Swiss-Prot record, chain A:
Keyword annotations from UniProtKB, A to Z: Cytoplasm, Glycolysis, Lyase, Magnesium, Metal-binding, Secreted
InterPro entries: Enolase (IPR000941), Enolase-like_C_sf (IPR036849), Enolase-like_N (IPR029017), Enolase_C (IPR020810), Enolase_CS (IPR020809), Enolase_N (IPR020811)
Alphabetical list of Gene3D superfamilies matching this protein: Enolase-like C-terminal domain (3.20.20.120), Enolase-like, N-terminal domain (3.30.390.10)
Species this protein is from: Escherichia coli O45:K1 (strain S88 / ExPEC)
A single cellular component GO annotation: cell surface
Binding site for (2R)-2-phosphoglycerate: 174, 349, 378-379, 400
Protein's job: Catalyzes the reversible conversion of 2-phosphoglycerate (2-PG) into phosphoenolpyruvate (PEP). It is essential for the degradation of carbohydrates via glycolysis.
Quaternary structure and interacting proteins, as annotated: Component of the RNA degradosome, a multiprotein complex involved in RNA processing and mRNA degradation.
Active site: 216 (proton donor), 349 (proton acceptor)
Catalytic class of the enzyme: lyase
Name of the protein this chain belongs to: Enolase
Family: Belongs to the enolase family.
Organismal lineage: Bacteria, Pseudomonadati, Pseudomonadota, Gammaproteobacteria, Enterobacterales
Catalytic activity: (2R)-2-phosphoglycerate = phosphoenolpyruvate + H2O
Length: 439, 438
């Protein structure tokens, strides 16, 4: 008899604008407004170590604004042709929204509007539609995902020593992470992570090492070797009163595409020590015997599918092996990997692909093949906490969102604390059992 | 005939929780829920270089959690006594809401509930009320401030080299800042700050210096003296195509309390070189003749009222002199300062005093005396961007909210972008003329 405003879910206005990311570079934000008054807003993150097969981040290249990194062309796409094509379409039909954008762009890699344009609208639409449906974003995402009412709290992997392209130090390995597997709630995980991070500062200070931070909030000391990162972490974990293995495990992201040069893996920080893919796999293996490293991401170059097959055959039964730049959140590429016995896990970045629909497709493909899905930030973030809702609503099981410093990382942890407080035992924290090779 | 939902602004629920700040330490967030379905939420920031007369940041001291930095006691005050005293009160009456809190706590420095509890609720209530009134927080703030419809976009001072308690380096001066006074909009100011900030990384990398960042998102290199920070900034400004003076001016915050020891100022990064008040003031003057430094905060110790009287007599006609730990956003203390010819500017930190009402009273007191008010962050921040709306709604004219890196800082710039986009020329960007002495 009366039609509620929630039913009035057609898009009436889309506003694109240029905001600033956690490195000080421009990025795209969009707002999507519905007839019933609902609004969602979101922003595109931005990577530094970008895989060569990522959907295109469109920047302006005008050296007179922001050293060429303006995003006015992307924002113009949001405000002009994207908006014109979505006005009057039902925001609750996520897959329908995304399809109109992807089709209008018409390109493989989203190079006409930019993946930055399309993603911001895609995520803002989802938020809008959640609110039109009368629910929080994680609940709407589980509905979009085909898994209604099913949630979990992700096991975070927390990058507390930063290197490679994220920092100005002599460390080649991009990320050294802790995982609070012994925690019973993500709130407890967050606190354990904070404690270890603070004890790590004390460890580093006593050795005369720098405690300023890199792009993801972890320390960026100069170390005598990439392995030494592991020793200092171990030290800190023990100083915080925790058992390495039992309470806390380790993970790494090598981002090895960043140090592959003329067909070899070259550790610049270790006097340009060069390795073939087999030898580099053996280097990684020796680390996994000395420390409880249970996950390794991008252990080899994006293009070295032979090397990945090998690595997966030698390490994959025991260790989670995460493809990041290997897969670029891309069903086309993940499928071929799954067929070739390559990796057993994927890092999910909605901006590697450019829409929430395509991102949920990549999570489905991984889950169906027994691969784990790790929901990830980019090194260039904003105060946006969307990935926390994505992790819970897809019950992905794991999240990669930074050190326990910088609100560009800590805003996602706080969103996790909020979600867990509303859901309680409806969103279990499953611990080490979420990680490939431990269940 | 029909009463709208916006009229149902009575408080129905208040929720407190422990969340995490930009250094990884706990802080208090509160949500305030109104009958008509309106919700506000906010969090308390937290300083590292905290004034000895700041209202109390209540922490737990339970060494088994967060190294003793838990805020469970504060959160309990929000969830029990505070909530129970405000449920049923009209959120639109900010002054009454803050009164009930202040009075129930009943101590001078909010040491029963903590200023962290009271502030979180205070701000969350304002958010709720704005929503109930159908308006952005900056517009509700202007009505609460007794200055309806009157706005400006603040001129930011951007701390791009970090020292003292904000960074693990050999720099004594806590902050070295740029201000993009030549900009016509706060959006252009933010662009100019980004550009200079990125040219600064290049200048420091050319010199072999570290480009990791301190707590406020500025670089934290080791330097050969404190004044070297100004030289590298000036290099950066020129490399960015800008003119120091005309486009960009400089500002400092010495946080000199942090290097005051047995009655002298001691520059530990320059071989423990000791200064009396007078000779530290002369050190500062010398920097003001070499570089276009137009504002200096906390040039002396919070307790050295005699020295500030001097510094103001000597430097105050031509430079802005901002009291921070000197005044602790506290009208009782600013009043005595204004009476004794001390400083000509105040740094406004809502958590130094613990309520939005007392913060607006400090802003009023300053403007009535012709002092400027600089709206400030703390070094421990959250994604909260309230200080952007506070700066605009009180047309304070200046803001101190970080380097152009770390979302704990950039969230405030983004919110200033959004505000200016909505207000256009109803919030002018007044540039250089906002600064005391210009
Ligand atoms: O390589 C990565 O996994 C990410 C996230 O840490 O960094 P970037 O956004 O720089 O690709
Ligand atoms: O001293 C200051 O002005 C502030 C803001 O930079 O730092 P803290 O919050 O550590 O007091
Ligand atoms: Mg990368
Ligand atoms: Mg990688
Ligand atoms: Mg201070
Ligand atoms: Mg100070």
């Amino acid at each position: 008899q009366q039609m509620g405003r929630g039913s009035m879910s057609k898009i009436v206005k889309i506003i694109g604008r240029e905001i600033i990311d956690s490195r000080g570079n421009p990025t795209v934000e969009a707002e999507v407004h519905l007839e019933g008054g609902f609004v969602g807003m979101a922003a595109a993150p931005s990577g530094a170590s970008t895989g060569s097969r990522e959907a295109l981040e469109l920047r302006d290249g005008d050296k007179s604004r922001f050293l060429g990194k303006g995003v006015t062309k992307a924002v113009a796409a949001v405000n002009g042709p994207i908006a014109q094509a979505l006005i009057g379409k039902d925001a609750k039909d996520q897959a329908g929204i995304d399809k109109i954008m992807i089709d209008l762009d018409g390109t493989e890699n989203k190079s006409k509007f930019g993946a930055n344009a399309i993603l911001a609208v895609s995520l803002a639409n989802a938020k809008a539609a959640a609110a039109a449906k009368g629910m929080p974003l994680y609940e709407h995402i589980a509905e979009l995902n085909g898994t209604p009412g099913k949630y979990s709290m992700p096991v975070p992997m927390m990058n507390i020593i930063n290197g490679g392209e994220h920092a100005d130090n002599n460390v080649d390995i991009q990320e050294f992470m802790i995982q609070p597997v012994g925690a019973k709630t993500v709130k407890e995980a967050i606190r354990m992570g904070s404690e270890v991070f603070h004890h790590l500062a004390k460890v580093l200070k006593a050795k005369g090492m720098n405690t300023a931070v890199g792009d993801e909030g972890g320390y960026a000391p100069n170390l005598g070797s990439n392995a030494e990162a592991l020793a200092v972490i171990a030290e800190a974990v023990k100083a915080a009163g925790y058992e390495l293995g039992k309470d806390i495990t380790l993970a790494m992201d090598c981002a090895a595409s960043e140090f592959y040069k003329d067909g070899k893996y070259v550790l610049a920080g270790e006097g340009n020590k060069a390795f073939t893919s087999e030898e580099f796999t053996h280097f990684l293996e020796e680390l996994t015997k000395q420390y409880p490293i249970v996950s390794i991401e991008d252990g080899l170059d994006e293009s070295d599918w032979d090397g990945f097959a090998y690595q997966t055959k030698v390490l994959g039964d025991k260790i989670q092996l995460v493809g990041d730049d290997l897969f670029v959140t891309n069903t086309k590429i993940l499928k071929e990997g799954i067929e070739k016995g390559i990796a057993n896990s994927i890092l999910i970045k909605f901006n590697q692909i450019g829409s929430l629909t395509e991102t949920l497709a990549a999570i489905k493909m991984a889950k169906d093949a027994g691969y784990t899905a790790v929901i990830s930030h980019r090194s260039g973030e904003t105060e946006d906490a969307t990935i926390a809702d994505l992790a819970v609503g897809t019950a992905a099981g794991q999240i990669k969102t930074g050190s326990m410093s910088r609100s560009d990382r800590v805003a996602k942890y706080n969103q996790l604390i909020r979600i867990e407080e509303a859901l309680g035992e409806k969103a279990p924290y499953n611990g080490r059992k979420e990680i490939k090779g431990q269940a």
